[PDB]
C-alpha cells in the first residue's frame, strides 16, 4: 500500500474517466457533499426496504 491524500486519489479516479482533474478540485466540497448524502440514502434505503 502506498499512502495518498484522498482528494488526490479522487483526482486519479476522475482522470481515469476522462474528466480533467481540476474538475475535482474546483468542486471538491460539492463532490464530498454528494458522496456523503449518497451514503446517507443507502442507510435509509437499507433501513426501510426489506
- Report residue 27 CA to chain centroid gap: 11
To another protein, the closest distance from the beta carbon of 22 in angstroms equals: 4
Residue 24 CB coordination number (10 Å): 19
* 47/13 Cα distance (integer angstroms): 30
Which residue of 1, 5, 6, 39 would you call a contact of another protein, by CB under 8 A? 5
Binding track over 12-41 against another protein, x by CB under 8 A: x-------x-x--xx-x-------------
Site size for another protein, by CB under 8 A? 9
Amino acid at each position: 500500500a502506498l499512502q495518498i491524500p484522498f482528494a488526490m486519489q479522487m483526482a486519479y479516479r476522475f482522470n481515469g474517466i476522462g474528466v480533467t482533474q481540476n474538475v475535482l478540485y474546483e468542486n471538491q466540497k460539492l463532490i464530498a457533499n454528494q458522496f456523503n448524502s449518497a451514503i446517507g440514502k443507502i442507510q435509509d434505503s437499507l433501513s426501510s426496504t426489506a
